[PDB]
Design a protein around this ligand. Structure first.
Ligand SMILES: CC(=O)N[C@H]1[C@H](OC[C@H]2O[C@@H](O[C@H](C)[C@H](N)C(=O)O)[C@H](NC(C)=O)[C@@H](O[C@@H]3O[C@H](CO)[C@H](O)[C@H](O)[C@H]3O)[C@H]2O)O[C@H](CO)[C@@H](O)[C@@H]1O
Length: 160
């Protein structure tokens, strides 16, 4: 009885709900911003990719990122910046057999998962304008209350 799946859309996630995205494919999985101090994008790289340059459109703008993933797992790079004049930088990585990606607004912070399945964990970026963060998803997603975060963490790590 999952709350979803919902099709790709731009929306403003409410505080204290996990958005859990079920990416089947490579490319941008999600991007979000409050236009002040957060811009984030999660980029998907398929298994067994040797080093190459690839293009991604972030907030309507083309960016070249060199990628690599010699794992049998999928790789999700979290790209980040805290100013509109700065370039995106690689902040964190989630290496996943499940292909599920999470984002949550809670407690003054923006949360994602990083590390490697089945031991992926949450970490944050800080913002002074949390409520104004909107996201665009590029794949189906589900919505899971923070009160059920252990269930979300299980899905991230072991699959729907
Ligand atoms: C350890 C833990 O529970 N971690 C959670 C994570 O919790 C996020 C919150 O971390 C707080 O600090 C912990 C819980 C301590 N009690 C503490 O006070 O240090 C943050 N407190 C800070 C930064 O001082 C808290 O932030 C506050 O939240 C309240 C209401 O939630 C209010 O918004 C305040 O303005 C704000 O300062 C949280 O950031 O949550 C993640 C995501 O669910 C879990 O994965 C993780 O396990």
């Amino acid at each position: 009885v999952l709350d979803g799946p919902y099709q790709p859309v731009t929306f403003k996630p409410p505080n204290d709900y996990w958005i859990l995205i079920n990416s089947n494919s490579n490319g941008v999985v999600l991007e979000g911003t409050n236009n002040t101090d957060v811009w984030v994008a999660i980029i998907s790289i398929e298994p067994n990719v040797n080093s190459e340059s690839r293009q991604y459109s972030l907030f309507g703008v083309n960016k070249q990122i060199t990628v690599v993933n010699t794992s049998n797992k999928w790789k999700f790079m979290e790209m980040f910046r805290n100013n509109s004049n700065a370039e995106f930088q690689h902040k964190r990585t989630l290496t996943s057999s499940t292909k599920l990606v999470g984002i949550l607004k809670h407690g003054g912070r923006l949360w994602t998962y990083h590390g490697e399945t089945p031991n992926a964990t949450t970490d944050y970026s800080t913002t002074s304008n949390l409520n104004e963060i909107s996201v665009t998803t590029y794949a189906e997603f589900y919505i899971i209350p923070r009160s059920q975060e252990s269930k979300c963490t299980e899905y991230i790590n072991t699959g729907l």
